[PDB]
mmCIF file with all atom_site columns, C-alpha atoms and ligand atoms in Angstrom:
data_model
loop_
_atom_site.group_PDB
_atom_site.id
_atom_site.type_symbol
_atom_site.label_atom_id
_atom_site.label_alt_id
_atom_site.label_comp_id
_atom_site.label_asym_id
_atom_site.label_entity_id
_atom_site.label_seq_id
_atom_site.pdbx_PDB_ins_code
_atom_site.Cartn_x
_atom_site.Cartn_y
_atom_site.Cartn_z
_atom_site.occupancy
_atom_site.B_iso_or_equiv
_atom_site.pdbx_formal_charge
_atom_site.auth_seq_id
_atom_site.auth_comp_id
_atom_site.auth_asym_id
_atom_site.auth_atom_id
_atom_site.pdbx_PDB_model_num
ATOM   1   C  CA  . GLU A 1 1   ? 32.878 5.870   -14.549 1.00 10.90 ? 309 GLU A CA  1
ATOM   2   C  CA  . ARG A 1 2   ? 31.214 3.141   -12.314 1.00 10.83 ? 310 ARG A CA  1
ATOM   3   C  CA  . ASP A 1 3   ? 31.188 -0.379  -13.591 1.00 13.40 ? 311 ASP A CA  1
ATOM   4   C  CA  . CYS A 1 4   ? 27.290 -1.210  -13.552 1.00 15.78 ? 312 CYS A CA  1
ATOM   5   C  CA  . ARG A 1 5   ? 27.957 -4.403  -15.780 1.00 19.70 ? 313 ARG A CA  1
ATOM   6   C  CA  . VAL A 1 6   ? 26.486 -7.611  -14.132 1.00 22.50 ? 314 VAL A CA  1
ATOM   7   C  CA  . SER A 1 7   ? 29.323 -9.552  -14.928 1.00 22.41 ? 315 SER A CA  1
ATOM   8   C  CA  . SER A 1 8   ? 31.639 -7.248  -12.844 1.00 23.90 ? 316 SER A CA  1
ATOM   9   C  CA  . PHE A 1 9   ? 29.568 -7.485  -9.864  1.00 25.25 ? 317 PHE A CA  1
ATOM   10  C  CA  . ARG A 1 10  ? 31.607 -8.684  -6.636  1.00 26.13 ? 318 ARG A CA  1
ATOM   11  C  CA  . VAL A 1 11  ? 30.052 -11.459 -4.643  1.00 27.92 ? 319 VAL A CA  1
ATOM   12  C  CA  . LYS A 1 12  ? 30.584 -13.349 -1.062  1.00 27.30 ? 320 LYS A CA  1
ATOM   13  C  CA  . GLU A 1 13  ? 33.761 -14.920 -0.878  1.00 28.49 ? 321 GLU A CA  1
ATOM   14  C  CA  . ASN A 1 14  ? 33.624 -18.711 0.085   1.00 28.60 ? 322 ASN A CA  1
ATOM   15  C  CA  . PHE A 1 15  ? 29.997 -18.437 0.603   1.00 27.31 ? 323 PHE A CA  1
ATOM   16  C  CA  . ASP A 1 16  ? 28.897 -20.510 3.843   1.00 25.05 ? 324 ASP A CA  1
ATOM   17  C  CA  . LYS A 1 17  ? 25.260 -21.876 3.376   1.00 27.16 ? 325 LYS A CA  1
ATOM   18  C  CA  . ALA A 1 18  ? 25.268 -23.434 6.730   1.00 27.42 ? 326 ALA A CA  1
ATOM   19  C  CA  . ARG A 1 19  ? 26.080 -20.216 8.533   1.00 26.95 ? 327 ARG A CA  1
ATOM   20  C  CA  . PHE A 1 20  ? 23.417 -18.257 6.144   1.00 29.62 ? 328 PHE A CA  1
ATOM   21  C  CA  . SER A 1 21  ? 20.944 -20.371 7.535   1.00 32.19 ? 329 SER A CA  1
ATOM   22  C  CA  . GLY A 1 22  ? 17.890 -19.418 9.951   1.00 31.96 ? 330 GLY A CA  1
ATOM   23  C  CA  . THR A 1 23  ? 15.781 -16.394 9.776   1.00 34.28 ? 331 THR A CA  1
ATOM   24  C  CA  . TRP A 1 24  ? 16.355 -13.228 8.042   1.00 37.14 ? 332 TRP A CA  1
ATOM   25  C  CA  . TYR A 1 25  ? 14.462 -10.058 7.615   1.00 38.15 ? 333 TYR A CA  1
ATOM   26  C  CA  . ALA A 1 26  ? 13.967 -8.215  4.741   1.00 40.88 ? 334 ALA A CA  1
ATOM   27  C  CA  . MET A 1 27  ? 14.954 -4.247  5.556   1.00 40.15 ? 335 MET A CA  1
ATOM   28  C  CA  . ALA A 1 28  ? 14.756 -2.691  2.412   1.00 39.87 ? 336 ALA A CA  1
ATOM   29  C  CA  . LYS A 1 29  ? 14.118 -3.646  -1.136  1.00 39.84 ? 337 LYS A CA  1
ATOM   30  C  CA  . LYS A 1 30  ? 14.863 -2.822  -4.515  1.00 37.42 ? 338 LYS A CA  1
ATOM   31  C  CA  . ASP A 1 31  ? 11.757 -3.926  -6.731  1.00 37.38 ? 339 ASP A CA  1
ATOM   32  C  CA  . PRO A 1 32  ? 11.947 -5.414  -9.787  1.00 36.84 ? 340 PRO A CA  1
ATOM   33  C  CA  . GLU A 1 33  ? 9.175  -5.056  -12.939 1.00 39.38 ? 341 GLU A CA  1
ATOM   34  C  CA  . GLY A 1 34  ? 5.805  -6.421  -11.614 1.00 35.03 ? 342 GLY A CA  1
ATOM   35  C  CA  . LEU A 1 35  ? 7.037  -6.371  -7.655  1.00 37.07 ? 343 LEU A CA  1
ATOM   36  C  CA  . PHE A 1 36  ? 5.859  -9.247  -5.949  1.00 34.91 ? 344 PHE A CA  1
ATOM   37  C  CA  . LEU A 1 37  ? 6.808  -8.752  -2.066  1.00 34.76 ? 345 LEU A CA  1
ATOM   38  C  CA  . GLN A 1 38  ? 5.333  -5.439  -0.562  1.00 35.24 ? 346 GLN A CA  1
ATOM   39  C  CA  . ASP A 1 39  ? 6.185  -5.762  3.058   1.00 38.55 ? 347 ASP A CA  1
ATOM   40  C  CA  . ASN A 1 40  ? 6.420  -7.703  6.097   1.00 38.83 ? 348 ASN A CA  1
ATOM   41  C  CA  . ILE A 1 41  ? 8.727  -9.956  4.263   1.00 42.22 ? 349 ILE A CA  1
ATOM   42  C  CA  . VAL A 1 42  ? 10.500 -12.548 6.437   1.00 43.38 ? 350 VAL A CA  1
ATOM   43  C  CA  . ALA A 1 43  ? 12.782 -15.294 5.026   1.00 41.33 ? 351 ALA A CA  1
ATOM   44  C  CA  . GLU A 1 44  ? 14.006 -18.857 6.481   1.00 42.95 ? 352 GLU A CA  1
ATOM   45  C  CA  . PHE A 1 45  ? 16.847 -20.311 5.352   1.00 42.85 ? 353 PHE A CA  1
ATOM   46  C  CA  . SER A 1 46  ? 17.887 -24.005 5.675   1.00 43.59 ? 354 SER A CA  1
ATOM   47  C  CA  . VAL A 1 47  ? 20.704 -26.294 4.181   1.00 44.53 ? 355 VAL A CA  1
ATOM   48  C  CA  . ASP A 1 48  ? 20.291 -30.138 4.155   1.00 47.66 ? 356 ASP A CA  1
ATOM   49  C  CA  . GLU A 1 49  ? 22.911 -33.085 4.674   1.00 45.08 ? 357 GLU A CA  1
ATOM   50  C  CA  . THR A 1 50  ? 23.653 -32.913 1.057   1.00 45.92 ? 358 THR A CA  1
ATOM   51  C  CA  . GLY A 1 51  ? 24.573 -29.518 1.207   1.00 43.23 ? 359 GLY A CA  1
ATOM   52  C  CA  . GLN A 1 52  ? 21.915 -28.459 -0.925  1.00 42.97 ? 360 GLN A CA  1
ATOM   53  C  CA  . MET A 1 53  ? 20.159 -24.765 0.455   1.00 44.71 ? 361 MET A CA  1
ATOM   54  C  CA  . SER A 1 54  ? 16.352 -23.962 0.553   1.00 49.23 ? 362 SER A CA  1
ATOM   55  C  CA  . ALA A 1 55  ? 14.249 -21.158 2.012   1.00 53.08 ? 363 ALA A CA  1
ATOM   56  C  CA  . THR A 1 56  ? 10.729 -20.158 2.829   1.00 56.37 ? 364 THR A CA  1
ATOM   57  C  CA  . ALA A 1 57  ? 9.630  -16.723 2.719   1.00 56.78 ? 365 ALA A CA  1
ATOM   58  C  CA  . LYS A 1 58  ? 6.055  -14.828 4.122   1.00 58.06 ? 366 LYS A CA  1
ATOM   59  C  CA  . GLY A 1 59  ? 5.317  -11.712 3.112   1.00 58.57 ? 367 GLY A CA  1
ATOM   60  C  CA  . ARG A 1 60  ? 2.155  -9.352  2.232   1.00 57.33 ? 368 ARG A CA  1
ATOM   61  C  CA  . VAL A 1 61  ? 1.730  -9.124  -1.516  1.00 57.11 ? 369 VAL A CA  1
ATOM   62  C  CA  . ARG A 1 62  ? -1.281 -6.698  -3.206  1.00 59.22 ? 370 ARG A CA  1
ATOM   63  C  CA  . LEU A 1 63  ? -2.967 -8.268  -5.978  1.00 59.24 ? 371 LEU A CA  1
ATOM   64  C  CA  . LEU A 1 64  ? -4.197 -5.405  -8.237  1.00 53.76 ? 372 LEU A CA  1
ATOM   65  C  CA  . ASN A 1 65  ? -7.396 -3.933  -7.590  1.00 53.63 ? 373 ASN A CA  1
ATOM   66  C  CA  . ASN A 1 66  ? -5.755 -3.846  -4.120  1.00 55.00 ? 374 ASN A CA  1
ATOM   67  C  CA  . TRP A 1 67  ? -6.230 -7.094  -2.911  1.00 57.38 ? 375 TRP A CA  1
ATOM   68  C  CA  . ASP A 1 68  ? -4.387 -7.662  0.142   1.00 55.54 ? 376 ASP A CA  1
ATOM   69  C  CA  . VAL A 1 69  ? -2.775 -11.244 0.796   1.00 55.03 ? 377 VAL A CA  1
ATOM   70  C  CA  . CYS A 1 70  ? -0.175 -12.798 3.130   1.00 56.36 ? 378 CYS A CA  1
ATOM   71  C  CA  . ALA A 1 71  ? 2.277  -14.753 0.382   1.00 55.14 ? 379 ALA A CA  1
ATOM   72  C  CA  . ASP A 1 72  ? 3.320  -18.192 1.677   1.00 52.76 ? 380 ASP A CA  1
ATOM   73  C  CA  . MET A 1 73  ? 6.694  -18.851 -0.487  1.00 57.24 ? 381 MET A CA  1
ATOM   74  C  CA  . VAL A 1 74  ? 9.124  -21.460 -1.175  1.00 57.71 ? 382 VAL A CA  1
ATOM   75  C  CA  . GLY A 1 75  ? 12.410 -21.440 -2.819  1.00 60.00 ? 383 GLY A CA  1
ATOM   76  C  CA  . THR A 1 76  ? 15.048 -24.085 -3.623  1.00 59.72 ? 384 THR A CA  1
ATOM   77  C  CA  . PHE A 1 77  ? 18.388 -23.638 -4.848  1.00 59.28 ? 385 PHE A CA  1
ATOM   78  C  CA  . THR A 1 78  ? 20.573 -24.854 -7.507  1.00 60.53 ? 386 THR A CA  1
ATOM   79  C  CA  . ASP A 1 79  ? 24.312 -24.446 -6.863  1.00 61.36 ? 387 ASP A CA  1
ATOM   80  C  CA  . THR A 1 80  ? 26.864 -22.842 -9.448  1.00 60.32 ? 388 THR A CA  1
ATOM   81  C  CA  . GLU A 1 81  ? 30.382 -22.877 -9.787  1.00 59.22 ? 389 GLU A CA  1
ATOM   82  C  CA  . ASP A 1 82  ? 30.354 -19.364 -7.750  1.00 57.16 ? 390 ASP A CA  1
ATOM   83  C  CA  . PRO A 1 83  ? 29.736 -20.719 -4.202  1.00 61.77 ? 391 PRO A CA  1
ATOM   84  C  CA  . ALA A 1 84  ? 27.487 -17.285 -4.200  1.00 59.58 ? 392 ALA A CA  1
ATOM   85  C  CA  . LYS A 1 85  ? 25.619 -17.591 -7.126  1.00 61.31 ? 393 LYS A CA  1
ATOM   86  C  CA  . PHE A 1 86  ? 22.613 -19.514 -7.228  1.00 61.83 ? 394 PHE A CA  1
ATOM   87  C  CA  . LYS A 1 87  ? 19.670 -20.396 -9.586  1.00 63.61 ? 395 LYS A CA  1
ATOM   88  C  CA  . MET A 1 88  ? 16.346 -20.245 -7.198  1.00 60.38 ? 396 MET A CA  1
ATOM   89  C  CA  . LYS A 1 89  ? 13.235 -22.104 -8.281  1.00 60.38 ? 397 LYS A CA  1
ATOM   90  C  CA  . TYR A 1 90  ? 10.455 -20.434 -6.406  1.00 57.97 ? 398 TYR A CA  1
ATOM   91  C  CA  . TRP A 1 91  ? 6.561  -20.848 -6.044  1.00 55.92 ? 399 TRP A CA  1
ATOM   92  C  CA  . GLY A 1 92  ? 3.720  -20.174 -3.734  1.00 57.85 ? 400 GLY A CA  1
ATOM   93  C  CA  . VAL A 1 93  ? 2.201  -22.877 -1.213  1.00 59.75 ? 401 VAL A CA  1
ATOM   94  C  CA  . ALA A 1 94  ? -0.903 -21.460 -3.203  1.00 57.12 ? 402 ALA A CA  1
ATOM   95  C  CA  . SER A 1 95  ? -1.179 -22.889 -6.918  1.00 54.00 ? 403 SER A CA  1
ATOM   96  C  CA  . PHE A 1 96  ? -1.776 -19.159 -8.318  1.00 52.95 ? 404 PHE A CA  1
ATOM   97  C  CA  . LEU A 1 97  ? 0.817  -17.185 -6.371  1.00 49.55 ? 405 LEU A CA  1
ATOM   98  C  CA  . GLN A 1 98  ? 3.867  -16.477 -8.489  1.00 50.03 ? 406 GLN A CA  1
ATOM   99  C  CA  . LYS A 1 99  ? 6.179  -19.005 -9.359  1.00 49.98 ? 407 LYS A CA  1
ATOM   100 C  CA  . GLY A 1 100 ? 9.627  -18.994 -11.802 1.00 51.64 ? 408 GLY A CA  1
ATOM   101 C  CA  . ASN A 1 101 ? 13.172 -19.331 -11.702 1.00 52.08 ? 409 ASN A CA  1
ATOM   102 C  CA  . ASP A 1 102 ? 15.698 -16.342 -10.562 1.00 53.90 ? 410 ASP A CA  1
ATOM   103 C  CA  . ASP A 1 103 ? 19.348 -15.988 -10.450 1.00 52.97 ? 411 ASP A CA  1
ATOM   104 C  CA  . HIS A 1 104 ? 20.041 -15.429 -6.451  1.00 50.45 ? 412 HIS A CA  1
ATOM   105 C  CA  . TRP A 1 105 ? 23.326 -13.786 -5.498  1.00 50.90 ? 413 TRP A CA  1
ATOM   106 C  CA  . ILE A 1 106 ? 24.470 -13.299 -2.474  1.00 48.83 ? 414 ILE A CA  1
ATOM   107 C  CA  . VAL A 1 107 ? 26.633 -10.163 -3.018  1.00 52.42 ? 415 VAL A CA  1
ATOM   108 C  CA  . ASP A 1 108 ? 27.593 -9.834  0.827   1.00 53.01 ? 416 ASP A CA  1
ATOM   109 C  CA  . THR A 1 109 ? 27.149 -11.006 4.363   1.00 51.84 ? 417 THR A CA  1
ATOM   110 C  CA  . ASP A 1 110 ? 28.683 -11.340 7.795   1.00 56.37 ? 418 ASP A CA  1
ATOM   111 C  CA  . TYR A 1 111 ? 26.225 -13.863 8.472   1.00 56.13 ? 419 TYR A CA  1
ATOM   112 C  CA  . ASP A 1 112 ? 25.250 -12.807 12.210  1.00 54.35 ? 420 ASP A CA  1
ATOM   113 C  CA  . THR A 1 113 ? 24.050 -9.338  11.072  1.00 54.43 ? 421 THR A CA  1
ATOM   114 C  CA  . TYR A 1 114 ? 23.442 -8.592  7.512   1.00 56.02 ? 422 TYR A CA  1
ATOM   115 C  CA  . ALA A 1 115 ? 22.923 -9.653  4.141   1.00 50.95 ? 423 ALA A CA  1
ATOM   116 C  CA  . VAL A 1 116 ? 22.954 -7.984  0.392   1.00 51.50 ? 424 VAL A CA  1
ATOM   117 C  CA  . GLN A 1 117 ? 20.751 -10.312 -1.948  1.00 52.50 ? 425 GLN A CA  1
ATOM   118 C  CA  . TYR A 1 118 ? 20.779 -9.741  -5.676  1.00 51.48 ? 426 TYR A CA  1
ATOM   119 C  CA  . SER A 1 119 ? 18.688 -10.982 -8.750  1.00 52.37 ? 427 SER A CA  1
ATOM   120 C  CA  . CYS A 1 120 ? 19.501 -9.920  -12.356 1.00 51.52 ? 428 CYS A CA  1
ATOM   121 C  CA  . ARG A 1 121 ? 16.232 -11.144 -14.237 1.00 52.35 ? 429 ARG A CA  1
ATOM   122 C  CA  . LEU A 1 122 ? 17.123 -9.833  -17.807 1.00 48.53 ? 430 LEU A CA  1
ATOM   123 C  CA  . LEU A 1 123 ? 20.079 -8.361  -18.962 1.00 46.15 ? 431 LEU A CA  1
ATOM   124 C  CA  . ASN A 1 124 ? 20.576 -5.239  -21.088 1.00 47.23 ? 432 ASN A CA  1
ATOM   125 C  CA  . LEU A 1 125 ? 22.841 -5.756  -24.490 1.00 49.22 ? 433 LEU A CA  1
ATOM   126 C  CA  . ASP A 1 126 ? 25.441 -3.633  -22.834 1.00 51.93 ? 434 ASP A CA  1
ATOM   127 C  CA  . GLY A 1 127 ? 25.622 -6.118  -19.859 1.00 55.55 ? 435 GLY A CA  1
ATOM   128 C  CA  . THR A 1 128 ? 23.855 -4.013  -17.330 1.00 55.54 ? 436 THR A CA  1
ATOM   129 C  CA  . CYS A 1 129 ? 20.762 -5.183  -15.992 1.00 54.00 ? 437 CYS A CA  1
ATOM   130 C  CA  . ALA A 1 130 ? 17.406 -4.358  -17.595 1.00 52.75 ? 438 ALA A CA  1
ATOM   131 C  CA  . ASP A 1 131 ? 15.424 -5.802  -14.798 1.00 50.06 ? 439 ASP A CA  1
ATOM   132 C  CA  . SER A 1 132 ? 16.661 -6.464  -11.228 1.00 49.68 ? 440 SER A CA  1
ATOM   133 C  CA  . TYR A 1 133 ? 15.686 -6.745  -7.610  1.00 49.87 ? 441 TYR A CA  1
ATOM   134 C  CA  . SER A 1 134 ? 17.650 -6.841  -4.301  1.00 49.81 ? 442 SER A CA  1
ATOM   135 C  CA  . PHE A 1 135 ? 16.669 -7.656  -0.694  1.00 50.33 ? 443 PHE A CA  1
ATOM   136 C  CA  . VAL A 1 136 ? 18.692 -6.227  2.195   1.00 48.19 ? 444 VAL A CA  1
ATOM   137 C  CA  . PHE A 1 137 ? 18.407 -8.634  5.050   1.00 49.33 ? 445 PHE A CA  1
ATOM   138 C  CA  . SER A 1 138 ? 18.814 -8.381  8.893   1.00 49.03 ? 446 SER A CA  1
ATOM   139 C  CA  . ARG A 1 139 ? 19.136 -11.081 11.487  1.00 49.84 ? 447 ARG A CA  1
ATOM   140 C  CA  . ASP A 1 140 ? 17.762 -8.718  13.969  1.00 51.84 ? 448 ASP A CA  1
ATOM   141 C  CA  . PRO A 1 141 ? 13.792 -7.024  12.625  1.00 54.36 ? 449 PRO A CA  1
ATOM   142 C  CA  . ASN A 1 142 ? 14.790 -3.683  14.366  1.00 55.07 ? 450 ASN A CA  1
ATOM   143 C  CA  . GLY A 1 143 ? 17.327 -2.801  11.879  1.00 55.82 ? 451 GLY A CA  1
ATOM   144 C  CA  . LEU A 1 144 ? 21.213 -3.341  11.173  1.00 55.09 ? 452 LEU A CA  1
ATOM   145 C  CA  . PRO A 1 145 ? 23.637 -1.490  13.510  1.00 57.77 ? 453 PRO A CA  1
ATOM   146 C  CA  . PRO A 1 146 ? 25.621 1.520   12.224  1.00 57.13 ? 454 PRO A CA  1
ATOM   147 C  CA  . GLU A 1 147 ? 28.659 -0.200  10.904  1.00 57.50 ? 455 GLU A CA  1
ATOM   148 C  CA  . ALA A 1 148 ? 26.469 -2.965  8.826   1.00 63.04 ? 456 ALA A CA  1
ATOM   149 C  CA  . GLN A 1 149 ? 24.192 -0.027  7.723   1.00 59.00 ? 457 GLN A CA  1
ATOM   150 C  CA  . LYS A 1 150 ? 27.643 1.882   6.059   1.00 56.14 ? 458 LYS A CA  1
ATOM   151 C  CA  . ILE A 1 151 ? 28.907 -1.346  4.668   1.00 56.16 ? 459 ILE A CA  1
ATOM   152 C  CA  . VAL A 1 152 ? 25.697 -2.263  2.931   1.00 57.20 ? 460 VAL A CA  1
ATOM   153 C  CA  . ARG A 1 153 ? 25.295 1.379   1.160   1.00 56.05 ? 461 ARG A CA  1
ATOM   154 C  CA  . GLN A 1 154 ? 28.544 0.661   -0.294  1.00 53.86 ? 462 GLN A CA  1
ATOM   155 C  CA  . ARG A 1 155 ? 27.475 -2.770  -1.953  1.00 52.75 ? 463 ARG A CA  1
ATOM   156 C  CA  . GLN A 1 156 ? 24.265 -0.931  -3.028  1.00 50.23 ? 464 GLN A CA  1
ATOM   157 C  CA  . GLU A 1 157 ? 26.152 1.474   -4.648  1.00 47.72 ? 465 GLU A CA  1
ATOM   158 C  CA  . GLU A 1 158 ? 28.303 -1.258  -6.102  1.00 52.23 ? 466 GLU A CA  1
ATOM   159 C  CA  . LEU A 1 159 ? 25.205 -2.736  -7.626  1.00 50.01 ? 467 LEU A CA  1
ATOM   160 C  CA  . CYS A 1 160 ? 24.373 0.385   -9.143  1.00 52.14 ? 468 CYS A CA  1
ATOM   161 C  CA  . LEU A 1 161 ? 21.023 0.457   -7.205  1.00 49.73 ? 469 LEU A CA  1
ATOM   162 C  CA  . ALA A 1 162 ? 21.720 2.738   -4.071  1.00 51.74 ? 470 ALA A CA  1
ATOM   163 C  CA  . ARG A 1 163 ? 19.236 5.382   -4.958  1.00 55.20 ? 471 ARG A CA  1
ATOM   164 C  CA  . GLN A 1 164 ? 16.548 2.590   -5.900  1.00 53.44 ? 472 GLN A CA  1
ATOM   165 C  CA  . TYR A 1 165 ? 15.524 0.867   -2.554  1.00 55.88 ? 473 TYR A CA  1
ATOM   166 C  CA  . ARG A 1 166 ? 12.423 1.157   -0.264  1.00 53.05 ? 474 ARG A CA  1
ATOM   167 C  CA  . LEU A 1 167 ? 12.153 0.772   3.072   1.00 54.24 ? 475 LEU A CA  1
ATOM   168 C  CA  . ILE A 1 168 ? 10.347 -2.697  4.303   1.00 55.20 ? 476 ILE A CA  1
ATOM   169 C  CA  . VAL A 1 169 ? 7.638  -2.295  7.019   1.00 52.09 ? 477 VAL A CA  1
ATOM   170 C  CA  . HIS A 1 170 ? 7.243  -5.217  9.870   1.00 54.11 ? 478 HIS A CA  1
ATOM   171 C  CA  . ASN A 1 171 ? 3.588  -5.021  11.885  1.00 52.68 ? 479 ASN A CA  1
ATOM   172 C  CA  . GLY A 1 172 ? 2.823  -8.115  12.303  1.00 53.19 ? 480 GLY A CA  1
ATOM   173 C  CA  . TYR A 1 173 ? 0.223  -7.966  9.421   1.00 55.65 ? 481 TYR A CA  1
ATOM   174 C  CA  . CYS A 1 174 ? 1.130  -11.829 8.689   1.00 53.48 ? 482 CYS A CA  1
HETATM 175 C  C1  . LIG B 2 .   ? 14.229 -16.351 -1.134  1.00 53.47 ? 829 LIG B C1  1
HETATM 176 C  C2  . LIG B 2 .   ? 13.317 -17.316 -0.355  1.00 53.47 ? 829 LIG B C2  1
HETATM 177 C  C3  . LIG B 2 .   ? 11.428 -16.761 -0.850  1.00 53.47 ? 829 LIG B C3  1
HETATM 178 C  C4  . LIG B 2 .   ? 11.429 -17.354 -2.122  1.00 53.47 ? 829 LIG B C4  1
HETATM 179 C  C5  . LIG B 2 .   ? 11.650 -16.237 -3.071  1.00 53.47 ? 829 LIG B C5  1
HETATM 180 C  C6  . LIG B 2 .   ? 10.024 -15.621 -3.503  1.00 53.47 ? 829 LIG B C6  1
HETATM 181 C  C7  . LIG B 2 .   ? 10.569 -13.977 -4.104  1.00 53.47 ? 829 LIG B C7  1
HETATM 182 C  C8  . LIG B 2 .   ? 10.518 -14.487 -5.346  1.00 53.47 ? 829 LIG B C8  1
HETATM 183 C  C9  . LIG B 2 .   ? 9.673  -12.874 -5.810  1.00 53.47 ? 829 LIG B C9  1
HETATM 184 C  C10 . LIG B 2 .   ? 11.052 -11.636 -5.658  1.00 53.47 ? 829 LIG B C10 1
HETATM 185 C  C11 . LIG B 2 .   ? 10.590 -10.467 -6.313  1.00 53.47 ? 829 LIG B C11 1
HETATM 186 C  C12 . LIG B 2 .   ? 9.675  -9.790  -5.644  1.00 53.47 ? 829 LIG B C12 1
HETATM 187 O  O1  . LIG B 2 .   ? 9.140  -9.999  -4.614  1.00 53.47 ? 829 LIG B O1  1
HETATM 188 O  O2  . LIG B 2 .   ? 9.088  -8.919  -6.681  1.00 53.47 ? 829 LIG B O2  1
HETATM 189 CL CL1 . LIG B 2 .   ? 25.780 6.752   6.381   1.00 52.91 ? 830 LIG B CL1 1
HETATM 190 CL CL1 . LIG B 2 .   ? 20.318 7.631   -2.353  1.00 47.64 ? 831 LIG B CL1 1
#
């Protein structure tokens, strides 16, 4: 009875790019098909004077046949009419790293503690997502406080993803 249509999902009201800038540690991830970032995932958000948001990310990614590499990624965000919904062009500093262009939604944040991100790469014909991913970010790499954890869990359920996350470990691999 829950609505899982992507078009129904609420996102962060009056999203403030400047307040969102700085270091975000991925605490949990819902993987898309053909997952890329594995763990040790840390993102750095910036906004420039024209108000355009960009980011970098580092994380371990496992090329198949189990080659471990620390990916260094770059992302640039094109605004839409919703201040919390973006198009993210991304690529690796190395040519061979994955590149592409994903929807990037800030579903919720309080700027100084937690953030919930969401991307639907491909819709189902009923408006639900066929291929999604989602990061939960923390300002503190040791994790969220209980109050924020509980808010995030609610947001995870609203995205119809709450059963599908895994924890992201940080152990200095990069
Ligand atoms: C968001 C700043 C980092 C640039 C985005 C690189 C992440 C793109 C791949 C995310 C999907 C995945 O990790 O499986
Ligand atoms: Cl709980
Ligand atoms: Cl669950």
